[PDB]
Each structure stands twice: as structure tokens, then as C-alpha cells.
Design an enzyme around this catalytic site. Structure first.
Site, mmCIF file in Angstrom:
data_model
loop_
_atom_site.group_PDB
_atom_site.id
_atom_site.type_symbol
_atom_site.label_atom_id
_atom_site.label_comp_id
_atom_site.label_asym_id
_atom_site.label_seq_id
_atom_site.Cartn_x
_atom_site.Cartn_y
_atom_site.Cartn_z
ATOM 1 C CB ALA A 125 32.362 44.195 41.618
ATOM 2 N N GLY A 143 35.566 43.129 46.679
ATOM 3 C CA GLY A 143 36.796 43.317 47.407
ATOM 4 C C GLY A 143 38.049 43.444 46.571
ATOM 5 C CB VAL A 144 40.646 45.746 46.158
ATOM 6 C CG1 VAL A 144 42.066 45.858 45.589
ATOM 7 C CG2 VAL A 144 39.625 46.238 45.137
ATOM 8 C CG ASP A 178 31.212 32.541 47.534
ATOM 9 O OD1 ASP A 178 31.069 31.932 46.460
ATOM 10 O OD2 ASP A 178 31.864 33.611 47.607
HETATM 11 N N1 LIG Z 1 44.776 36.647 53.578
HETATM 12 C C1 LIG Z 1 45.061 36.486 52.315
HETATM 13 N N2 LIG Z 1 46.351 36.138 51.919
HETATM 14 C C2 LIG Z 1 46.729 35.955 50.592
HETATM 15 N N3 LIG Z 1 45.886 36.104 49.560
HETATM 16 C C3 LIG Z 1 44.618 36.440 49.918
HETATM 17 C C4 LIG Z 1 44.141 36.642 51.216
HETATM 18 N N4 LIG Z 1 42.819 36.970 51.210
HETATM 19 C C5 LIG Z 1 42.507 36.973 49.913
HETATM 20 N N5 LIG Z 1 43.565 36.660 49.093
HETATM 21 C C6 LIG Z 1 43.561 36.586 47.589
HETATM 22 O O1 LIG Z 1 42.513 37.447 47.124
HETATM 23 C C7 LIG Z 1 41.481 36.723 46.414
HETATM 24 C C8 LIG Z 1 40.148 37.393 46.757
HETATM 25 O O2 LIG Z 1 39.916 37.484 48.195
HETATM 26 P P1 LIG Z 1 38.468 37.236 48.806
HETATM 27 O O3 LIG Z 1 38.670 37.414 50.289
HETATM 28 O O4 LIG Z 1 37.876 35.929 48.400
HETATM 29 O O5 LIG Z 1 37.561 38.439 48.325
HETATM 30 P P2 LIG Z 1 36.433 38.533 47.214
HETATM 31 O O6 LIG Z 1 35.198 38.767 48.056
HETATM 32 O O7 LIG Z 1 36.741 39.722 46.342
HETATM 33 O O8 LIG Z 1 36.318 37.187 46.442
HETATM 34 C C9 LIG Z 1 41.644 35.290 46.921
HETATM 35 O O9 LIG Z 1 41.003 34.407 45.990
HETATM 36 C C10 LIG Z 1 43.163 35.184 47.080
HETATM 37 O O10 LIG Z 1 43.836 34.903 45.845
HETATM 38 MG MG LIG Z 2 36.422 35.331 47.145
#
Ligand SMILES: Nc1ncnc2c1ncn2[C@@H]1O[C@H](COP(=O)(O)OP(=O)(O)O)[C@@H](O)[C@H]1O
Ligand SMILES: [Mg+2]
Length: 337
Positions: free
Chosen positions: A23, A25-26, A137
Site C-alpha cells: 500500500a 511502495g511498489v 522497522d
Molecule cells: N533495491 C532493491 N533490490 C531488490 N529488491 C528490492 C529492492 N528494494 C526493495 N526490494 C524488494 O521489495 C520489497 C519491498 O521494498 P521496501 O523498500 O521494503 O518497500 P515497502 O515500504 O513497500 O516495504 C523488499 O522486501 C524486497 O523484496
Molecule cells: Mg519494506
């Protein structure tokens, strides 16, 4: 890639795969046609509610301020075309292979890899804490991993500078946080690190509470129910102290018997992290100096960080609430900095 996922980005980018979808980030991997380098692009819509915009602003400032081997590297942020149509933020970062939740749920990790992963997590926490930043977090899905086992922390929007709101997943939140209006503390991050280490050993989350009540019940079932006044002293709310007194009196579980296969030194470190009284929890720096991690510990290669003033997140202390228009200008000016 689901057609419902729409990115409004440079034609130089070709979306590849959906890596994360929530909800807030994507995240998708994308090929940078010009260089043939594959990157990760995080899309965020921050202006429907103030909390999303605040989370976006903290995340981008921390990402652009920190440089550390265990903190995800940001490459660029899309520059908006018009202030009026600005309603999406695109953060371009180095592409990582997976995340620790996926690794733990799909791999039978050796003690050496568990050591290296928790070591790198703690090394990142050390620099954040030394800069007066608490993450709030920390959990496996927010720990990114490469094929060589390099680990980098991400998702900095819930961070605060130590001096409705998004809150960390209940499974990794310190008990004092669910028992009162606890003052932000480095100890809460250490608790999360303890949950992450316990999960590495157990290969499943150690405190998968179904709700607030259940979460506290699982936690005390392992660390023991604080019973005496001295133990209940760290809790401000008298109502909260009374509630704890209504829980069953559990003794601390015998972890040496709960984890007969685990390295004894690792269990010792874990017990120093999962302590009820936040003031008694080991610090990140001390944890890096723990015997369990001697193979990786290098007192001369563990950045201490530099203090960031609270005014860096001045917006967190606003009296007269910030309009979404106020927050839009703040994020806009941070993008162009
Ligand atoms: N730089 C990145 N490279 C590869 N996978 C990523 C990266 N950033 C995020 N992800 C994938 O996306 C998921 C969600 O990203 P995140 O930055 O934690 O956003 P959110 O705020 O929606 O939790 C991570 O748990 C991971 O599996
Ligand atoms: Mg996350």
C-alpha cells in the site's frame, strides 16, 4: 508483470519484474536500455494522506544522506515535470538479488551465513544509531541480499531522529512500544535485531503474534514475564503495569534446550538482545564485539556515524499540522537537492 502495475518513467527504462507490492511502495526491477545495467525502481504515491508523504520524505532524505556498505545505494530519483501533476515518486536504486525474508524462508543457512547476516545488519544499525537515527522497522524483508551474501538495509521511512502513524510489523516490535508511549530508543531497534537473529536460528519468526495481546503472550513465553517492581519500572503507564500483572508468570525459556543445534555463542548474544528492560539490552556496537561475531568483527571497519540534528526531520515536530501541499513542496525541494 501484472498489467495493473503502471510506471510513468523514462523510455530508457524497460520494466522487468515485480519484486514487491504494498500500500505504500511498489518495487520492480528494470533494464536501463542505455547501459544494459539492471536496476530497482521503487514507486510511491505519497499524497493521499499525510503519513504517506511523511514516510516518503524521511525515506528519501535518509537514502540520500547515508553512504555505508550495509545501506542500500540510491542511484537517482525521477525529476518531476510539473508541480501540478506531481503525484508519484520514483526512486532508482542498485538491484539486489533477494531479501532476507525470502532467504530465510527458502534456505537452510549455515551458522557462518547467519553470523555474516546479523553482523552486517548490526553494522548498519551501528552507523544509524551513532548518527542518532533509529530505523524502527527492521525485519527480514527490509534487509536486501546479494549473491555474495552482502546485506543492505532499506525502507527508511519509519525512521526518527532520537532526541495515524506507520508502525513496524507487530512481530518485530519491542514490548515497551505496545505497552505505552515509550520514548524512541536505540533499544527498540536492538529488539528487532534480536527477533531477526532468533528467526535466523529458528528458521521461522519467533514471535508471530496474531494481535497485541497474543504478541505479548508469545514474547513473555520466551523471555519470561517481568514480575517484580524493579522489572516493571521501565513501564510508565500504571495501567500498563497492571495489565502485565494479569498475564501468566512465565519463567525465561531454556534457549540452550530450545536450540540444541545452534552455536552456544549465538544463543548468548540472542539472550542479550531479547531483554524486556530496554536499558539492559546490548547496544549495536557491543553486539559487534560479541564473541559470536569475532570472525567478522573489525573495530577499525565499523563506522560510528555522525550526529544528524533533529531539524533534519523538522517536520516531525510541527504544531500546526502540515498540509499535503506543504508536504508536496518539501518532497519536491528534497528531490532537487
Ligand atoms: N533495491 C532493491 N533490490 C531488490 N529488491 C528490492 C529492492 N528494494 C526493495 N526490494 C524488494 O521489495 C520489497 C519491498 O521494498 P521496501 O523498500 O521494503 O518497500 P515497502 O515500504 O513497500 O516495504 C523488499 O522486501 C524486497 O523484496
Ligand atoms: Mg519494506
Amino acid at each position: 508483470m501484472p498489467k495493473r502495475i503502471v510506471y510513468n518513467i523514462s523510455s530508457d527504462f524497460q520494466l522487468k519484474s515485480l519484486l514487491g507490492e504494498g500500500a505504500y511502495g511498489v518495487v520492480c526491477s528494470a533494464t536501463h536500455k542505455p547501459t544494459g545495467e539492471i536496476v530497482a525502481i521503487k514507486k510511491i504515491e505519497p499524497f493521499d494522506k499525510p503519513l504517506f508523504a511523511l514516510r516518503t520524505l524521511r525515506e528519501i532524505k535518509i537514502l540520500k544522506h547515508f553512504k555505508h556498505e550495509n545501506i542500500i545505494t540510491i542511484f537517482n530519483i525521477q525529476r518531476p515535470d510539473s508541480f501540478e501533476n506531481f503525484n508519484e515518486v520514483y526512486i532508482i536504486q542498485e538491484l539486489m538479488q533477494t531479501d532476507l525474508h525470502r532467504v530465510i524462508s527458502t534456505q537452510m543457512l549455515s551458522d557462518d551465513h547467519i553470523q555474516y547476516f546479523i553482523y552486517q545488519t548490526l553494522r548498519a544499525v551501528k552507523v544509524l544509531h551513532g548518527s542518532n537515527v533509529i530505523h524502527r522497522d527492521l525485519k527480514p524483508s527490509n534487509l536486501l541480499i546479494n549473491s555474495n551474501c552482502d546485506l543492505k538495509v532499506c525502507d527508511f521511512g519509519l525512521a526518527r531522529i532520537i532526541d495515524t502513524e506507520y508502525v513496524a510489523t507487530r512481530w518485530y516490535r519491542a514490548p515497551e512500544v505496545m505497552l505505552t508511549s515509550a520514548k524512541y530508543s536505540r533499544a527498540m531497534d536492538v529488539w528487532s535485531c534480536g527477533c531477526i537473529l532468533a528467526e535466523l536460528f529458528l528458521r521461522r519468526p519467533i514471535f508471530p503474534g496474531r494481535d497485541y495481546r497474543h504478541q505479548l503472550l508469545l514474547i513473555f513465553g520466551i523471555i519470561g514475564t517481568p514480575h517484580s517492581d524493579n522489572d516493571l519500572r521501565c513501564i510508565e503507564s500504571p495501567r500498563a503495569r497492571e495489565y502485565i500483572k494479569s498475564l501468566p508468570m512465565y519463567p525465561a525459556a531454556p534457549l540452550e534446550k530450545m536450540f540444541p543445534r545452534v552455536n552456544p555463542k549465538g544463543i548468548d548474544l540472542l539472550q542479550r538482545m531479547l531483554v524486556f528492560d530496554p536499558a539492559k539490552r546490548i547496544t549495536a556496537k557491543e553486539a559487534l564485539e560479541h564473541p559470536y561475531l569475532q570472525t567478522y568483527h573489525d573495530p577499525n571497519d565499523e563506522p560510528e556515524g555522525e550526529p544528524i540534528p533533529p531539524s533534519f526531520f523538522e517536520f516531525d515536530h510541527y504544531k500546526e499540522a502540515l498540509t499535503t501541499k506543504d508536504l508536496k513542496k518539501l518532497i519536491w525541494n528534497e528531490i532537487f537537492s
